[PDB]
A paper describes a structure:
Single-domain antibodies (sdAbs), including camelid-derived nanobodies and human-derived variable heavy domains (VH), have emerged as a transformative class of biologics due to their small size, high stability, and superior tissue penetration. Derived from Staphylococcus aureus, Protein A is a 42 kDa surface protein consisting of five homologous immunoglobulin-binding domains (A–E) and an S region that functions as a signal sequence and cell wall-binding region (XM). It strongly interacts with the CH2-CH3 region within the Fc domain of IgG1, IgG2, and IgG4 and can also bind certain antibody fragments. Using this approach, we successfully reprogrammed multiple human-derived VHs and camelid-derived nanobodies to acquire high Protein A affinity, enabling efficient, tag-free purification via industry-standard Protein A affinity chromatography.
Additionally, we selected the camelid nanobody VHH3, which targets human TNFα, shares low sequence similarity with n501, and does not bind to Protein A, to further evaluate the versatility of our model. We also identified the L90Q mutation in both VHH3-M1 and VHH3-M3. The glutamine at position 90, similar to glycine at position 74 in n501, forms hydrophobic interactions with Protein A. However, its side chain can form hydrogen bonds with the side chains of N92 and R20, which are essential for binding to Protein A. This interaction can draw the side chain of R20 closer to D39 of Protein A domain D. In contrast, leucine at position 90 cannot form hydrogen bonds with N92 and R20, thereby removing the constraint on the side chain of R20. Consequently, the L90Q mutation may restore the interaction between R20 and Protein A. To validate this hypothesis, we resolved the complex structures of VHH3-M1 and VHH3-M3 with Protein A domain D through co-crystallization, achieving resolutions of 1.49 and 2.0 Å, respectively. The interaction pattern between VHH3-M1 and Protein A closely resembles that of n501, with a root-mean-square deviation (RMSD) of 0.643 Å. This interaction is characterized by the formation of seven hydrogen bonds and two salt bridges. However, in VHH3-M1, the side chain of residue S17 is displaced, disrupting the hydrogen bond with A28 of Protein A domain D. Concurrently, the side chain of residue T77, also due to displacement, establishes a novel hydrogen bond with D39 of Protein A domain D. Most notably, residues R20 and N92 not only engage in hydrogen bonding with the side chain of Q90 but also form hydrogen bonds with Protein A in both VHH3-M1 and VHH3-M3, corroborating our initial hypothesis.
Author numbering:
A (entry chain C): 1 to 127
B (entry chain H): 2804 to 2856
Write the structure that this text describes.
């Protein structure tokens, strides 16, 4: 029902910034469709973990505590993208970052609440 | 949004951020004005940690 493709990962020095993007498309998708888009990240040796989410219709946002103030999530409902600005990056932010979406309101901040997934983009923060 | 506006000007003049960092934090303020206070707080932390030695 929605297709997602994420991009923007790469190699960055500690303290640096990167911006990820996720292109959203769907046959019945519109500017106030009641969807939730999020970013998850999978660090080395770890499972996918919640980073941030945005309600597509209202643009209300929520962040994992570990990224609050350093990362911002936003969405453009003309171009149909969701972006993640990442500042003040640290080696522990190294991970594969995935765009994800749900057609509705998540009941958790876990992977099980999101039924659509991007393929992932790889972020490496060197020191 | 006044929290957004004064935060923008503070970040602009932080002396120990480089251009890429300043520009990234400014973009965050545009991305999510609801996080202005937290974005400013993290810029301050980076400005402090990058104080020249």
């Amino acid at each position: 029902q929605v297709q997602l493709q994420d991009s923007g990962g790469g190699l960055v020095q500690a303290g640096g910034s990167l911006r990820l993007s996720c292109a959203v498309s769907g046959r019945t998708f519109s500017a106030h469709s009641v969807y939730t888009m999020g970013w998850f990240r999978q660090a080395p040796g770890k499972e996918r973990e919640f980073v941030a989410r945005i309600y597509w219709s209202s643009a209300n946002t929520y962040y994992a505590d570990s990224v609050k103030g350093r990362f911002t999530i936003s969405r453009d409902n003309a171009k149909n993208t969701v972006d993640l600005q990442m500042n003040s990056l640290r080696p522990e932010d190294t991970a594969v970052y995935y765009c994800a979406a749900r057609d509705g309101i998540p009941t958790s901040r876990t992977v099980g609440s999101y039924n659509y997934w991007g393929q992932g983009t790889q972020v490496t923060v060197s020191s | 949004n006044k929290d957004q506006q004064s935060a923008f000007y503070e970040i602009l003049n932080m002396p120990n951020l480089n251009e890429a960092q300043r520009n990234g934090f400014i973009q965050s303020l545009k991305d999510d004005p609801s996080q202005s206070t937290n974005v400013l707080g993290e810029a301050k932390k980076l400005n402090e940690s990058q104080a020249p030695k």
